[PDB]
Amino acid sequence: RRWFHPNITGVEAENLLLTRGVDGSFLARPSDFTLSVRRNGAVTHIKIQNTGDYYDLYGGEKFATLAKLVQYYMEHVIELKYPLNCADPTSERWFHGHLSGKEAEKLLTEKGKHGSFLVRESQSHPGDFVLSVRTGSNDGKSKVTHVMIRCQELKYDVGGGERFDSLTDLVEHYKKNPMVETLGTVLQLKQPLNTTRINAAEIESRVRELSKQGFWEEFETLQQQECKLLYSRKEGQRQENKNKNRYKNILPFDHTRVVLHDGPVSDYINANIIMPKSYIATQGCLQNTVNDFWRMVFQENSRVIVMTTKEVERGKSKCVKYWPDEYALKEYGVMRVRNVKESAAHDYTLRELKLSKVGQGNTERTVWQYHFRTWPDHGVPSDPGGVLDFLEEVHHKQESIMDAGPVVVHCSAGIGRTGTFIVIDILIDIIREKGVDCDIDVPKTIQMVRSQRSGMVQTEAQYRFIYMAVQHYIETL
Ligand SMILES: CC1(N)CCN(c2cnc(-c3cccc(Cl)c3Cl)c(N)n2)CC1
């Protein structure tokens, strides 16, 4: 994941490839994203677009993450051979750039644990760097240790030994080969210092700091961590399952996927169980998946569905109508759905459905369909009010039903908009019950969700929207 450079211009990108690279060499960067590839001694740039639903390469295919886009094309003309590595530490969890000695010690004391480390721009020595580690309150059993990093001729060192190309090289080297103190203190770089974990009550202050862009820096630092969540999706690739996918490359992880037990390969659905109240993050239905969608709802005993998109957007199908018309009755394979009544609110439409297995009478249960419909075609809503009110209603309908299964959430690919609502709900559920006095970490919760379904929360727009949604809920609490 060293191939992504987040702070360079197309001119800098052209030099790098033509001078410090060869034919086949590549790199990605924001300009939307740009894929700069080297072909026959020349740089060829490519557009990568993200609407908030998926990653789109012009002429290429639709992907859940930037890492899988690069991975798919490093085996499948424009050739992707040698990634050109970035030496910039901006997108690194441990880097805190312009930071003071006491400001660093303050954070390592307040939030630090054993092996909690961070790198900063040297206060005293000009142009150099500082590695601060906490090995282990007021008992003196734990201590802060300052290791000077000398910057000389575009290379980094800790006063001796090897000279590294980037701070990233140095950090990853002393993480594997820890520095031993003169009296034997092992300077373990166990994990970087947590800074994103903030109290629920101090959200207005944190947003104010992130608005200074702070949200962009924090968002790409989380995108850097996506290569750590590249878990197997073997089932989605199986011949008989390729048609059951909206997008052949946006597949559910094998470990979290929903396995259909109803009964060749009738067990597949492009869906995942999200366990932080549980959820099912799925895509919009296809003609050949409608019956499977109802087989899932039945099996997992789901009583609430959250539709985050319209049936048709910008002239194309975002989710096929899988529910019968008002007052009508329909059979979807072995399932029978009755649209009891539709009630329209301003931001949504609620559909009271009655799902049951064909042949069995007591198998009937009410499935409340919440269809959100004021989400813009491109981007995120201006105000989080409508979304929050919707989710508040969804929670209380879910809470009212005894032994209810997971809340089914779905948009187009079921990763972007689906992920935004699920993350907003998980965070809002904490503040609801565990009050305003609890710790809220937005990128940790996203990463936890992303471990369960690829690409959950697609854009910086949605990332910021999650903070603005959380802030509002507290401000009105
Ligand atoms: C200036 C800086 N280098 C960029 C922003 N920044 C951070 C830090 N940590 C996360 C984080 C937190 C929990 C889980 C995961 Cl996976 C991640 Cl990545 C984050 N998103 N941004 C602070 C340092």
Residue numbers in the entry: 4 to 34, 40 to 84, 95 to 154, 160 to 235, 245 to 295, 300 to 312, 325 to 525
Please share text taken word for word from the publication where this structure appeared.
The non-receptor protein tyrosine phosphatase SHP2, encoded by the PTPN11 proto-oncogene, is required for normal development and functions downstream of growth factor, cytokine, and adhesion receptors. SHP2 contains two tandem SH2 domains (N-SH2 and C-SH2), a catalytic protein tyrosine phosphatase (PTP) domain, and a C-terminal tail that has at least two phosphorylation sites. Normally, the binding of tyrosine-phosphorylated ligands to the SHP2 tandem SH2 domains is required to overcome autoinhibition, but oncogenic mutations of SHP2 destabilize the autoinhibited conformation and lead to enhanced basal activity in the absence of tyrosine-phosphorylated ligand stimulation. Allosteric modulators that stabilize the closed form of SHP2 have been recently reported. This class of allosteric inhibitors was designed to stabilize the autoinhibited state of the enzyme by acting as a molecular glue between the N-SH2 domain and the catalytic domain.
To determine whether SHP099 could revert SHP2E76K to the closed, autoinhibited conformation, we determined the structure of SHP2E76K bound to the small molecule inhibitor SHP099 to 2.8 Å. Remarkably, when complexed with SHP099, SHP2E76K adopts an autoinhibited conformation like that of SHP2WT, with near-identical C-SH2 and N-SH2 domain orientations relative to the PTP domain. However, at the N-SH2•PTP interface, the K76 side chain is not in contact with the PTP surface and is instead poised to interact with Q79, which stabilizes the position of K76 in the open state of SHP2E76K. Although the E76K mutation reduces the inhibitory potency of SHP099 for SHP2 by more than 100-fold, binding of SHP099 to SHP2E76K can revert the structure of this variant to its autoinhibited conformation. For the most active mutant SHP2E76K, we extended the dose–response curve to a higher SHP099 concentration in order to deduce its IC50 of 34 ± 6 μM in the absence of p-IRS-1. SHP099 inhibition of the most active oncogenic SHP2 mutants investigated here, SHP2D61V and SHP2E76K, is orders of magnitude weaker than inhibition of SHP2WT, and the responsiveness of the mutants tested using purified protein is mirrored in cell lines engineered to express the same spectrum of mutated SHP2 proteins. Thus, although it is possible to revert the most potent activating mutation back to the closed conformation with SHP099 in vitro, cell lines expressing strongly activating mutations are effectively resistant to SHP099, likely because stabilization of the open conformation by phosphotyrosine ligands further increases the favorability of the open state in cells.
